[PDB]
Design a protein around this nucleic acid. Sequence first.
DNA 1: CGACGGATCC
DNA 2: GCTGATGCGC
DNA 3: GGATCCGTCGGGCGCATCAGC
Length: 276
Amino acid sequence: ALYEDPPDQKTSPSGKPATLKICSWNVDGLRAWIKKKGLDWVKEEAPDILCLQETKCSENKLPAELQELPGLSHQYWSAPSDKEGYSGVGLLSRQCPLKVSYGIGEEEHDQEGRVIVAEFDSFVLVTAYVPNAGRGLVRLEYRQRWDEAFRKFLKGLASRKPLVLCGDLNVAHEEIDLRNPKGNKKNAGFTPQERQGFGELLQAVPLADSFRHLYPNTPYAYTFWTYMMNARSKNVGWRLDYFLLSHSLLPALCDSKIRSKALGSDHCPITLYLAL
DNA sequence: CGACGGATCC
DNA sequence: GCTGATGCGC
DNA sequence: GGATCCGTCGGGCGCATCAGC
Ligand SMILES: [Mg+2]
């Protein structure tokens, strides 16, 4: 079954207007994505903050088109050392953040280029590219260890102002979050271990899944489709990309969108509207 | 990782 | 410098 | 004997490195 994201709701339950628009996108190769016109779509979307995953691009190789973004002029990039064509995340913002950091504790040593933390006036933003369990689950145990380290890192951050965590969390939380739950229960992204880690993330920090909070029973809503076997044209997909919010931000929540039609990667953008 | 072949269920 | 094969991970 | 289950198989994408010229 195909899916049509509902219209943008731009006012909070309190009646406050959205003042902040955040877009998150696993671009599956930033240089390729730009050649496939992904930046033209960002311009049409005009977010205040853009978070990117799988840039697969060290900062010296960023295309000049990224120098041409006057409304997203504060840019922060992270890539892993000695593994440049993998991972990589970016955060681009209209306003300058108060603080920026990289990693979840030991990036000066680990340097994975998967997490960026940016503190703004009223909230802390984290964008993440969560490590894949891999074909045949060969990296599932590392993913479980990373999950636990990430949870405890985030619990620390949420100690002060509210948290917004966005990005490719590389798990479909529940059966409604992918088209083939039963066939994928032993595949990366839908193992009981990864699903449980996502549940623990929500409970331990604590965080709410913005999209599911708003649309708790909506099926066929995905953010990823394999390039293989024309899966996207059939909407055989997974919901891997999320906006998770501290409970204290839920009165600020206007909408959480899935931009199904934006091409340029095997994930589509997701967009958050907050009334701060 | 979805398509597919083959086994199992009533 | 440039192409395309191969490797590897998603 | 249609629906469901389950294990196996081939493989699209992007980017690095390499050989060759
Ligand atoms: Mg990917």
